[PDB]
TrEMBL record, chain A:
Sequence positions that bind Zn(2+): 87, 89, 93, 106
Enzyme class, broadest EC rank: lyase
Keywords: Lyase, Metal-binding, Zinc
Top-level taxon of origin: Bacteria
Signal peptide positions on this chain: none
Residue span(s) of domain Alpha-carbonic anhydrase: 1-220
Disulfide bonds: 25-172
Similarity comment text for this entry: Belongs to the alpha-carbonic anhydrase family.
Lyase in keyword set: yes
Database matches in Pfam families: Carb_anhydrase
Protein name: carbonic anhydrase
CDD domains: alpha_CA_prokaryotic_like
GO molecular function: carbonate dehydratase activity; zinc ion binding
Length: 224, 217
């Protein structure tokens, strides 16, 4: 009974069935991901990202993950959150106005209390991405892992939909603070393809979930 | 049987009372909460309210409740939630920027998908309020008159404030208080048996709250 995104006995349709920890995958009223169609415009969020060497780059639970030493942070409303990892989904899991991207990255953060702030940004096919370099190369070796350009990773000025949701994979824990960033980065078709290859050419995209009038704001901030 | 006392059958122990109530503890979007940080917007709510005779006016589970035939609605984002009842709380369960009110009413709605939309308004002891009377003596209720013409509200995602504490509830909490007379305040509260039915503020996992304005009529 190991969960996956395959439409068989162990898919998303049935995560709630595989363990009793996963019940909130079906019973939960703030589940991710969803379609960002309806939101509110408006006017808080501070980025402390230094280029860092991963403490490890690996395949786990259908995703490609880079973990970090807790030297990086996000500050949202005085509360502080440290970057734990960056992992990937193909295709992108959240949908902005029913538009799909081929890939997205998730910058998971935690506070000392374990509350999560997750940061989602999407990828489209095109220009080669410098910043992917140490991850594609870091995954081939357990290495003195080369640094990732975190401060340079996502746009300086950014527009996002902030809302509360859940983890997008079991155990689908809610209370998660989602910041989904409208502007996609580009990725080489080769770059994209080996990422897909390295996630075992098998998509790790949870289906959009029942939305119970989720209150979404669209806003702006600066990430440098 | 659940209560609001600081003893053994209370809010800090509601989940323990049944398995269905376990979300009361484990939930990550429980209500009430204190409305302190919020976004501002300049962008959707249509009231189809009518003076309506109550199908029943009764006390259930610590509250004063008036139920209705499914003839009143609220339109939100192209869906229509129908009104089932209004009930009261003393004191007011939700807080706005830390301010407290002696009483509140909740207007409970359901859509086609069963999704909840609940409206809360605060009261302040002042002038005799006409709209309470049809309830208090129990008369049609002037739903059309009950709420201010123009409202500033807070909107967010929470839950029922009483067992089973279900989530996915679309709260609209109106800043502008209505008035109530002390003769109304005593009588209504004593119909509530001088047991304050106000659930304590729950943990707040960074609830995304918007401030907006609307016309109720
Ligand atoms: Cl995503
Ligand atoms: Cl209230
Ligand atoms: Zn993810
Ligand atoms: Zn209530």
């Amino acid at each position: 009974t190991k969960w996956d995104y395959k439409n068989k006995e162990n898919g998303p349709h049935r995560w709630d069935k595989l363990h009793k920890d996963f019940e909130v995958c079906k019973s939960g009223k703030s589940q991710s991901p969803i379609n960002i169609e309806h939101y509110y415009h408006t006017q808080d969020l501070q980025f402390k990202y230094a280029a860092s060497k991963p403490k490890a780059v690996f395949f786990t639970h259908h995703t490609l993950k880079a973990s970090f030493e807790p030297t990086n942070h996000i500050n949202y409303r005085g509360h502080d959150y440290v970057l734990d990892n960056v992992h990937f989904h193909a295709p992108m899991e959240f949908l902005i106005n029913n538009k799909t991207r081929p890939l997205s990255a998730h910058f998971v953060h935690k506070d000392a209390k374990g509350r999560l702030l997750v940061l989602a940004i999407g990828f489209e096919e095109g220009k080669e991405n410098p910043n992917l370099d140490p991850i594609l190369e870091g995954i081939q070796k357990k290495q003195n892992f080369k640094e990732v350009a975190l401060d340079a990773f996502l746009p300086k000025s950014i527009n996002y939909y902030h809302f509360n949701g859940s983890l997008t994979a079991p155990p689908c824990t809610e209370g998660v603070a989602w910041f989904v960033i409208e502007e996609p980065l580009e990725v080489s078709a080769k770059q994209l393809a080996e990422i897909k290859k390295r996630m075992k050419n098998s998509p790790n995209q949870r289906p959009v979930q029942p939305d119970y009038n989720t209150v979404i704001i669209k806003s702006s901030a600066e990430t440098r």
